[PDB]
Amino acid sequence: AKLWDSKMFAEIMMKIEEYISKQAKASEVAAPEYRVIVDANNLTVEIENELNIIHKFIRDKYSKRFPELESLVPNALDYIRTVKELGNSLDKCKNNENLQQILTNATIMVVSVTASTTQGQQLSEEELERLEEACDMALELNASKHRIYEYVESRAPNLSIIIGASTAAKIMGVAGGLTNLSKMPACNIMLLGAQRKTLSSTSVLPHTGYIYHSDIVQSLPPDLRRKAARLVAAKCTLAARVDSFHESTEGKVGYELKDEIERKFDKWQE
RNA sequence: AGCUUUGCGCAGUGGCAGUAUCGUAGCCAAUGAGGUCUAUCCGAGGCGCGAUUUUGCUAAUUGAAAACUUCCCAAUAGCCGUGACGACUAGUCGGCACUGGCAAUUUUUGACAGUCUCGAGACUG
Numbered sequence: 001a002k003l004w005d006s007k008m009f010a011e012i013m014m015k016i017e018e019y020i021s022k023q024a025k026a027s028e029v030a031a032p033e034y035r036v037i038v039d040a041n042n043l044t045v046e047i048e049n050e051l052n053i054i055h056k057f058i059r060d061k062y063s064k065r066f067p068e069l070e071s072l073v074p075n076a077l078d079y080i081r082t083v084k085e086l087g088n089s090l091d092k093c094k095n096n097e098n099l100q101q102i103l104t105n106a107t108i109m110v111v112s113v114t115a116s117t118t119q120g121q122q123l124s125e126e127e128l129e130r131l132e133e134a135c136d137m138a139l140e141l142n143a144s145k146h147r148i149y150e151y152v153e154s155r156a157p158n159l160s161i162i163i164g165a166s167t168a169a170k171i172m173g174v175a176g177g178l179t180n181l182s183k184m185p186a187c188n189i190m191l192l193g194a195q196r197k198t199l200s201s202t203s204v205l206p207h208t209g210y211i212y213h214s215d216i217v218q219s220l221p222p223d224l225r226r227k228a229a230r231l232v233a234a235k236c237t238l239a240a241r242v243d244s245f246h247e248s249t250e251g252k253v254g255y256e257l258k259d260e261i262e263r264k265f266d267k268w269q270e
Numbered sequence: 271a272g273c274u275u276u277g278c279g280c281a282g283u284g285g286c287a288g289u290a291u292c293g294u295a296g297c298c299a300a301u302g303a304g305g306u307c308u309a310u311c312c313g314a315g316g317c318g319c320g321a322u323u324u325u326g327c328u329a330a331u332u333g334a335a336a337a338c339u340u341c342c343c344a345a346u347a348g349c350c351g352u353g354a355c356g357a358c359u360a361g362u363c364g365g366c367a368c369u370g371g372c373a374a375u376u377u378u379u380g381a382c383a384g385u386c387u388c389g390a391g392a393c394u395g
Contacts, residue, residue, distance in 0.1 A: 186302080188310050207309060230302090238301055257301095267297085 003057065007137055010050050014144050017043050021151045028154070037155055038173035040148050047145045051076060054138045058083060061131055065120045066090060072111050077142060078102050082111070084135040088123055090115040158239035161254030162261070163232065167214050171236075174210070182244035189240075190233035211236070216261070224268055235261055 020036050055076040062083050063070065069086075073079040081102045086092050093099065093112035100108065123131070153166055156178060160168045174192045175181040181189065194209030211217060212229045220228050235257040242253050 185310085187312090191310060194310095202306090230305095234302065241301090264298085 006050065006053070010046065010141070014043065014047070014141075018144060018147065021148060025151055025154070032177070033155065034169075034173045034177055037152065037169050040152055041170055041173060044145065044148055044152075047141055047148075051138060051141055051145075054134060054141070055080065058131060058134055058138070061123075061127060061134075065123050066115065066118055067120055068114050068118060069111065072107055072114065073103070077138075080135050080138050083131065084139075087132075088128055090118065156240070156243040157249060157251040158254030158257070159236060159243050161251045162236055162239050162258050163211070163214055163216060167210060171210050178240065178244055182241045184237070186230075186234045186237040189237055190229060220265065220269075227268075228265065231261060231264060 017036075017039060021040060024033070024036065058080055059070055065088065066083075066086065069082065070079065073082050082099070085096070085098050085102070093108065093115055096108075103111070149166075152169060155165070155169050156172070159172075171189065171192050172178055172181055175184065175189075190211055191207060192210050194207060197204045197206070205212065208226075208229065211233050212225060214232070217225055217228050217232055239254055239257055242248055248254075
């Protein structure tokens, strides 16, 4: 009913946002940049949700030809690519070179074995074309997501040294600029970008965002991740302040703080 | 001029508990310790290691001994008789000595004890 409607609405929204992003990328060589950065950050979530609904649609449609494939390929993009590559003919697991670019040899064996005894029936040509167009829409949305992520990475030497460049951009955009970030307590920076995550509480990680879900924090055992978050946030705050005055542009402070964080992690894990 | 607030030091008088007190040329910590109700909120120490039932005094116990310049033998330390010595006329007296005795009316082995009356008497056994 609203499948193509949502597809077109997201196409228009992504067209506007990607025009803005490509204009910024071209211009790389009162309407601040962090505004478009946060816009892209939320558009990423929108794209993820749209990809999820598209994946659900594809699963429901393809569950009559190869009902068992969903179990073997839990990942969304991999499942979409596999259904695109197999189509109505399940005899494409034999001597296939594209399938080896999506899955591992073990799961290729498993899917080939399962396809031989599946009890599924053929799809009509109309259903096949609907599935193909859905897959193409998913792939183009994924390409748009990749472009957004490239721009988001391209977009504060010390704060970036401590935590990447993507997370720094996310936290500064949600804060509303580097100056606004510099004048917040660390306990508030720790909570920038935290959802509510309705229960269906310990299993939800109630108070975590943009620092808990970071490369350097997720790089620890779960039981140490909250403490680490705190620590990182603390040091991040310091770096932010040093950045708000344009001092230590070489990143010396960031390197020192990262070394201290690494020493604390090592001591925790000894 | 008194009254009064906070912190510290020094003493006196009370209460409570010994599963806790102390140390930290070890590490981390307001540039944030620690957050299991409880979080755009709270806000100080934590971790590891180490010591463990002071001293004087007093009391009790163990044992032969519990920690600081006695036992034993010999002898010395009232009268009636008797033996001598002596004195005075068979008798008497004085002192000395020790070889039997000293609860049956005049003495030293208990007519005493209780009671009552106003220094004095009575009653009972």
